[PDB]
Amino acid sequence: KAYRGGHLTIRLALGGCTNRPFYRIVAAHNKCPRDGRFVEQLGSYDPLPNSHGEKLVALNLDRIRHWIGCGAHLSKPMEKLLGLAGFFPLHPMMITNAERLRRKRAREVLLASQKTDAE
Amino acid sequence: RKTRHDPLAKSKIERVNMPPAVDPAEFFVLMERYQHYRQTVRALRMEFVSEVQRKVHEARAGVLAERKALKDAAEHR
Amino acid sequence: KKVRPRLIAELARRVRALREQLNRPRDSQLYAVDYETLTRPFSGRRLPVRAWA
Amino acid sequence: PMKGRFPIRRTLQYLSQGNVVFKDSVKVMTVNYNTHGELGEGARKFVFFNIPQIQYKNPWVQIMMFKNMTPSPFLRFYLDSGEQVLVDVETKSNKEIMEHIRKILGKNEETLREEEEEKKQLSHPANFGPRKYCLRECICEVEGQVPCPSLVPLPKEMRGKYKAALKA
Amino acid sequence: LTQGLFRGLSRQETHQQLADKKGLHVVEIREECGPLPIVVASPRGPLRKDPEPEDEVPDVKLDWEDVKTAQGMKRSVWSNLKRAAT
Amino acid sequence: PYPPLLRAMIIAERQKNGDTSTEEPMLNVQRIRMEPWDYPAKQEDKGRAKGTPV
Amino acid sequence: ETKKPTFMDEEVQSILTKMTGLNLQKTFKPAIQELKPPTYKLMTQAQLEEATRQAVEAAKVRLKMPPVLEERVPINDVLAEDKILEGTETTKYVFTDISYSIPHRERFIVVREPSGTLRKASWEERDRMIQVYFPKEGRKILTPIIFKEENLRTMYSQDRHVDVLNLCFAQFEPDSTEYIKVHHKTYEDIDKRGKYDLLRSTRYFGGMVWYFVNNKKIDGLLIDQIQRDLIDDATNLVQLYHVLHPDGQSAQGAKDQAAEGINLIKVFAKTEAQKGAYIELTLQTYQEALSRHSA
Amino acid sequence: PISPYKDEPWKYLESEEYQERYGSRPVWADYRRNHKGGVPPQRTRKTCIRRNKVVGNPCPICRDHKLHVDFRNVKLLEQFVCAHTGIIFYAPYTGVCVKQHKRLTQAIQKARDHGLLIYHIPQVEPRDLDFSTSHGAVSATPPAPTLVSGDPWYPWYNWKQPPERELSRLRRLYQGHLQEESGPPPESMPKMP
RNA sequence: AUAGGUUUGGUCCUAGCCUUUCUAUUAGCUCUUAGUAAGAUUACACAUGCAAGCAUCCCCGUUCCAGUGAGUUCACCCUCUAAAUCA
Numbered sequence A: 001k002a003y004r005g006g007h008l009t010i011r012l013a014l015g016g017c018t019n020r021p022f023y024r025i026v027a028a029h030n031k032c033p034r035d036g037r038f039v040e041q042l043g044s045y046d047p048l049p050n051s052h053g054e055k056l057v058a059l060n061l062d063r064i065r066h067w068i069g070c071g072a073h074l075s076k077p078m079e080k081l082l083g084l085a086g087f088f089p090l091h092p093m094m095i096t097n098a099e100r101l102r103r104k105r106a107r108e109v110l111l112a113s114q115k116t117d118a119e
Numbered sequence B: 001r002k003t004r005h006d007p008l009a010k011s012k013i014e015r016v017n018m019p020p021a022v023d024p025a026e027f028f029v030l031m032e033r034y035q036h037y038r039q040t041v042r043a044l045r046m047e048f049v050s051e052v053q054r055k056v057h058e059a060r061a062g063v064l065a066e067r068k069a070l071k072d073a074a075e076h077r
Numbered sequence C: 001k002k003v004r005p006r007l008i009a010e011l012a013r014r015v016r017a018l019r020e021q022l023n024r025p026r027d028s029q030l031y032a033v034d035y036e037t038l039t040r041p042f043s044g045r046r047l048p049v050r051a052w053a
Numbered sequence D: 001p002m003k004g005r006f007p008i009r010r011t012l013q014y015l016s017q018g019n020v021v022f023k024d025s026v027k028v029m030t031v032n033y034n035t036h037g038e039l040g041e042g043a044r045k046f047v048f049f050n051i052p053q054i055q056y057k058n059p060w061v062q063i064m065m066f067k068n069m070t071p072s073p074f075l076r077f078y079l080d081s082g083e084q085v086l087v088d089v090e091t092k093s094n095k096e097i098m099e100h101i102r103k104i105l106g107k108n109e110e111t112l113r114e115e116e117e118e119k120k121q122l123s124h125p126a127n128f129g130p131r132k133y134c135l136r137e138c139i140c141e142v143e144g145q146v147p148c149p150s151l152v153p154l155p156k157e158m159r160g161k162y163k164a165a166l167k168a
Numbered sequence E: 001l002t003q004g005l006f007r008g009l010s011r012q013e014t015h016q017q018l019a020d021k022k023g024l025h026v027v028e029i030r031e032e033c034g035p036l037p038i039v040v041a042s043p044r045g046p047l048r049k050d051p052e053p054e055d056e057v058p059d060v061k062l063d064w065e066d067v068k069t070a071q072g073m074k075r076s077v078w079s080n081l082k083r084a085a086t
Numbered sequence F: 001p002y003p004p005l006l007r008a009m010i011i012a013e014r015q016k017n018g019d020t021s022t023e024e025p026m027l028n029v030q031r032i033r034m035e036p037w038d039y040p041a042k043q044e045d046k047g048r049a050k051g052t053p054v
Numbered sequence G: 001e002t003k004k005p006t007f008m009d010e011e012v013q014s015i016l017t018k019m020t021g022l023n024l025q026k027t028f029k030p031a032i033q034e035l036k037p038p039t040y041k042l043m044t045q046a047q048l049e050e051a052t053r054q055a056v057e058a059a060k061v062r063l064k065m066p067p068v069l070e071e072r073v074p075i076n077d078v079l080a081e082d083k084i085l086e087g088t089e090t091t092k093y094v095f096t097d098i099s100y101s102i103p104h105r106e107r108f109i110v111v112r113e114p115s116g117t118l119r120k121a122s123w124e125e126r127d128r129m130i131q132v133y134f135p136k137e138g139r140k141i142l143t144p145i146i147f148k149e150e151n152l153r154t155m156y157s158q159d160r161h162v163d164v165l166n167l168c169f170a171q172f173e174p175d176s177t178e179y180i181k182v183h184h185k186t187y188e189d190i191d192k193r194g195k196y197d198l199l200r201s202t203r204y205f206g207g208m209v210w211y212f213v214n215n216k217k218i219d220g221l222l223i224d225q226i227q228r229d230l231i232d233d234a235t236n237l238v239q240l241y242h243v244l245h246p247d248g249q250s251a252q253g254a255k256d257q258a259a260e261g262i263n264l265i266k267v268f269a270k271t272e273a274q275k276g277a278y279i280e281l282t283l284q285t286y287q288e289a290l291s292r293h294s295a
Numbered sequence H: 001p002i003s004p005y006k007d008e009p010w011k012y013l014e015s016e017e018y019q020e021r022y023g024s025r026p027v028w029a030d031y032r033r034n035h036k037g038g039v040p041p042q043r044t045r046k047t048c049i050r051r052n053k054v055v056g057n058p059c060p061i062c063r064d065h066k067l068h069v070d071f072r073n074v075k076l077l078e079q080f081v082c083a084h085t086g087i088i089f090y091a092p093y094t095g096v097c098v099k100q101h102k103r104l105t106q107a108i109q110k111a112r113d114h115g116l117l118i119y120h121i122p123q124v125e126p127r128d129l130d131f132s133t134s135h136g137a138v139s140a141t142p143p144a145p146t147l148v149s150g151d152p153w154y155p156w157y158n159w160k161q162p163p164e165r166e167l168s169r170l171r172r173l174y175q176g177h178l179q180e181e182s183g184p185p186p187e188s189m190p191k192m193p
Numbered sequence I: 001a002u003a004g005g006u007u008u009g010g011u012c013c014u015a016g017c018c019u020u021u022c023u024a025u026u027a028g029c030u031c032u033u034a035g036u037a038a039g040a041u042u043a044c045a046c047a048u049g050c051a052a053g054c055a056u057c058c059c060c061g062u063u064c065c066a067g068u069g070a071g072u073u074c075a076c077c078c079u080c081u082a083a084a085u086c087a
């Protein structure tokens, strides 16, 4: 299906069943459906911890590099996975989100302490 | 999803979206991170583009490729 | 394999492109703004709240 | 039984036993052979047995046959460059003719192995998808990973129906 | 059917009868035993020293039904159905 | 510096090829000139609103 | 200076190859699997001997001994420690590089822990992930229960040692702890109950001999070889023992006495062999019987 | 009924009663399914015992209450596996209902996992051609300068308080739409006592 | 297909029809629970609500996704070469 413009993108295609998500890393045209036609599969991402307490992520690094070199863009969830893997720098929003959580939890410790101290 | 021709909903006629409140300290720190992050990623992207182009050129007119082409011609003759 | 010509599809296409060149709106119409409601009367679209000031 | 003499020739097993895979230069192959004469027996056997095997392995090469045009049988190959390879096949057996053209115009076993290895890379074991293309359809098939809800129901805590109930 | 079955089974040639007629060893090749050559029958008389001529192309009459199945061209909803032990 | 993983993969290729060196791989970001987000864009390539009036 | 021979040395391979033996009936035992109608060929004696020779060639490939490797060292290398990510995630991420054309021992498999540490995957995780994405026939992701001490003792009671070795070879890697542990525990059971013939004419005999020689317990194997009229193999076993223990009483004894053939067994029997008395009695019985047949 | 062999199921197959009833033939030798036509249904009945009530023609396993399908009853399980090929007979072969065939299939696999039932274990080839553990992927990678000093990999991971002049620009640009300024974040993640 | 029933007073041959197997809709009667998958007969007519916004104005998007199967060798390969992505 020849689209008007568009570009290749490496993004997460949702699979699995209800309450059992499973993502396939695929390089697909920007305008194609999420779970529709793709150019090449570049890995997978199981977001549910397994028996060993691991979230398994497969990355065809040789083919990911090839497609980034051909002008393929990247979705935010895909950029955050490559940041955790050490293939790219940590996406700034993971740093900021981590800092926001630190501040929230620091504020939560005050009320808890006051209750135990005052009462 | 709606098409350009489909009419706008009546309930949304008066809807006005308000931008979120901006935190000065967080805003500036975040802006720099994007500037650095995108600079590093742009450098990486350039490196990957060069590798792809080199591999294609090597396959087309590489020394090993040309050597094989000459050997094939000699064998035929 | 011989495709049947679609003449009306090419006729209207030329007419449309032409009318887009003769009835094109001017910058005076496109970029006008009502300073009380802060909306472009050409399209009736509100400007972003950050641009109102 | 199967019709015709030597019905084995009309079997996929026999047609895939040809060892002559022409190089990409070969475009046309003209087989001139005589219907009678002891010196043309091999050429007649080569047309009877081996042309089906050659065409099966080289679907895009045109093979054209001419009967009783010359006193002796011969093969002529027309290459893409414009060169014409004349192979005289008089007195040779059908096995000798087949071995001869493999040497001068057939891809070696190394060239073929390489092409087959390139096909192996097309199917990646790690890729998941429909059985026509991939080994496994979902990660749930891999032991240790959370099984499919259809087989093993998920805990109530992990189900969206009750995730929002505990919260509200 | 009965008269035909007893006619065929009575006329089947044994491995020993084959070896004696051909004067050659009958070697059984089993896939479950790899390349191990199992000699099932040997000629009781003298053993020929000339190898049987190996014809390049066998001039044998093939049953279309057999060839059609080997090529996966035979679809039948009644074939290979689960049945009680016989 | 290269990110953690990419660095480890470039150092491994060096040792595999036989090159013995202790230099750190680093990305040359001098070529990448990061311009501000409010830099004037090219007006020649910018489109124009269509005629449909309200 | 003077390097002690390795398991893969041509000399050791020749000795261990001959010690194993080649029983074509055992190597190609009929397998209990899905069967097909056998084929038949009319063959001359010359042709029959050629096919038998080809079976010997194929059988020798099936008997190729696996290389003995030393236990792999645990991997404990940290690539980075991003302390900012501490506390953000509750589960660790395992990233596997599934690039097709890479040797499995050259693949980068890293783990992002909840603390933020990007570390290389342990040997166990590495093997588990390679099976998840490059599944091998006969290997399981979760360790089969057969390898428990109780379950492995049942397999031994049934004289199924070779099966335990094939199961181990498929599941575990040659340099893994579980791999070496099982082979070492199987070799011990063979020695205690004298079941050395179970592993003869198999690719696992060499490994069994290598284990016994390097632990100085070749007494039981020597007795069995003599009891079975395999002096040539028994003498080669004693010879090999000397090469892997040159600075030994038996090695010096043979050097001092220039012992050869049966003499090597006597020298080793008295000096180093733990069961020197039993060996002499066993060797004595054989030599007497051999003298009778010679007459 | 209450069979006395539930605890030691292998005993029944060695008792005199078993030899009188079955002898040397498999327990399913005499069973015949009742069905219309010459070709039987491709599935056997789901279960022979419904609500503690047995059907008219109970299957070989369900007709004898003393036959216990257990991974330890190796002699019983062997009767339901092909001696020449080692494949488990499908239910139509012997006539066992789907329920008992599922219990049999699991028990045969459990017995094979425990080593009680012999099965063909093939000889497999090694996974890797080379066994060297010298590649960086498995060896130790030289630590990066930042890792040795304990600094973040990139300097922009750490929070750097912006200058006061820059904070004034943002406070002019977003007049009336400003949040409380946030200082440097905690050095480590707190925890609820 | 491992086949079976059926022409006749009876036999053999040929032959059609049907039976036995496996699925999908609809109907009758009947029906306890949980998880999962799938789900108008009709390109007939449609009440009502919603399905495209974003953004310091310009642009960009609404040409996608979602839907249907009316029409029907526009889909595949090669050659050539626009637009688009690689700031």
Ligand code: FES
Binding pocket: A016, A017, A020, D137, D138, D139, D140, D141, D147, D148, D149, D150
């Ligand atoms: S198909 Fe994999 S979770 Fe359902």
Ligand SMILES: [K+]
Binding pocket: none
């Ligand atoms: K009929």
Ligand SMILES: [K+]
Binding pocket: none
């Ligand atoms: K119904």
Ligand SMILES: [K+]
Binding pocket: I069
């Ligand atoms: K249609």
Ligand SMILES: [Mg+2]
Binding pocket: none
């Ligand atoms: Mg262009």
Ligand SMILES: [Zn+2]
Binding pocket: H047, H048, H049, H058, H059, H060, H061, H062, H063, H096, H097, H100
């Ligand atoms: Zn039953």
